[PDB]
């Protein structure tokens, strides 16, 4: 279930410790010889895979910004990649926690970026999550159900299920990412079901 202790474990640890995320801005990629799904990178040397054929031909040889959860494989990302740009101005995404059934206070987290990937809203929440409600937790295993929706004004909605252990390995956890899937920063807000 979603009370096996390792997994709540890597989980946790994978969105919880820094230095697990990759986040570079205005970086080029290498000129090296890789696959139709995939870039490396010089941040540590990065495999930064995505889901479809055409995704990376978007990003070559062109400056990105990489925000993205990394395993050793030396690294490899699961998208997390988005054309750099110029107007970093802070944007705050409104979070809406509801912690058992109970409504809690206005949240938010900031992104700087006009576009922001799934990715990078996902891993902002899940550590703001870990830090005020410790969702993950294994010694009282108070949460078990959860979830994280980004419902954005298209009419569409995005959910990351907060206890998918994939197969139990890292990159079994980030593969959910790969479609390196972006959305507008001020078009859209989160909802948080923990429970």
Known sequence: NSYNTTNRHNLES???????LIEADSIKNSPDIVTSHMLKYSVKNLSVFFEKDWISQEF??????????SAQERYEAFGGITLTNSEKKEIKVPVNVWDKSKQQ?????TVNKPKVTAQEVDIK????????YDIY???EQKYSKGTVTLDL???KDIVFDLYYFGNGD?????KIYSNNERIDST???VDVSIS
């Open 187 to 189: 078009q859209f807000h």
């Open 137 to 139: 937790n294994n010694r």
């Open 170 to 174: 890292f990159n079994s956890m980030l």
């Open 60 to 69: 070559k040889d062109k400056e990105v910004d990489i925000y993205a959860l």
């Open 14 to 20: 994978l969105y919880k410790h820094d230095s697990n």
């Open 125 to 132: 929440v899940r550590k703001l999550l870990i830090k005020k």
């Open 105 to 109: 206070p206005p949240m938010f987290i």
């Open 153 to 155: 004004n298209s009419g």
